């Protein structure tokens with residue numbers, strides 16, 4: 102799994118430990134080993150949500166499987182909770198796009214997962 | 216809806232008002248309320264289009280519905296027009312990827328937009 | 334086609350001519366002409382792979398067609414080889430997401446690549 106967060110929150114507001122917490126909690130939530138979890142945090146972005154530049158986040162989660170109705174609702178509660186707690190971003194100013202990737206469409210280690 | 220612009224145009228060339236104009240014109244174009252429109256502009260990028268580092272942009276628009284043949288052509292005319300006018304980027308050096316997102320695959324406000332079944 | 338590389342490798346470690354080399358290698362690999370290849374490299378990123386902040390890359394390749402099982406395997410060998418050689422990133426710390434785009438879902442030059450129907 103691969104999680105990306107883009108936010109206008111300043112880099113200094115990103116707490117020590119944040120990447121590791123995302124790695125560990127996403128490993129739990131998706132049921133995949135932590136060694137395969139990739140996380141990417143992009144602070145200080147020029148963005149608006151609803152025409153306002155108050156804190157907001159635009160995110161994505163790509164996973165080979167483990168994507169669906171109930172699972173995505175769970176991921177959103179977990180991730181919005183983390184963004185609210187750690188970056189002080191309001192949940193209703195977060196978007197998360199979920200992608201269920203075909204193993205043939207994911208490259209890794211000179212090949213693909215198919 | 217969510218619109219992202221990545222460009223090698225410098226931040227100083229992004230005009231006052233640009234995010235708001237994108238927000239409002241996208242609300243108008245998609246028929247979605249302005250409150251739900253998110254915009255993200257990323258200047259000063261290291262990128263090339265056709266091997267040339269002349270001004271270019273790589274963009275995406277994600278929407279739950281309102282994606283399709285004629286609508287996407289209309290979005291492209293609007294967005295290329297804005298990028299040409301405001302950032303001075305040639306329309307033929309712009310790519311825009313359109314994504315029709317399923318409501319169940321979009322997170323917001325502690326949940327998703329699939330609130331009908333559980 | 335559009336290739337994006339996001340990495341925690343520093344900007345100064347990105348060799349001059351990297352974007353041009355990616356352009357040429359991708360044109361060759363996809364069969365699409367160089368003029369239509371777009372490349373974007375984003376260094377100095379805050380990211381981890383498997384919990385480690387050693388060099389890694391998260392990438393995407395979008396193409397209208399020319400995406401699939403065998404071809405994606407070939408692309409991965411090519412792109413990982415390039416990232417390993419040029420950016421000194423180990424192949425098992427690289428992810429590449431492949432996207433087969435519909436022509437109607439790619440905007441360019443004030444329209445899309447769906448020019449056949451109205």
Ligand SMILES: O=c1c(-c2ccc(O)c(O)c2)coc2cc(O)ccc12
Nearest residue numbers: 102103133137163164165202428430
């Ligand atoms: O899902 C993944 C995995 C993955 C992690 C653990 C596994 O056991 C497995 O088969 C696949 C690895 O990298 C990815 C990169 C992506 O852009 C999307 C999904 C994944």
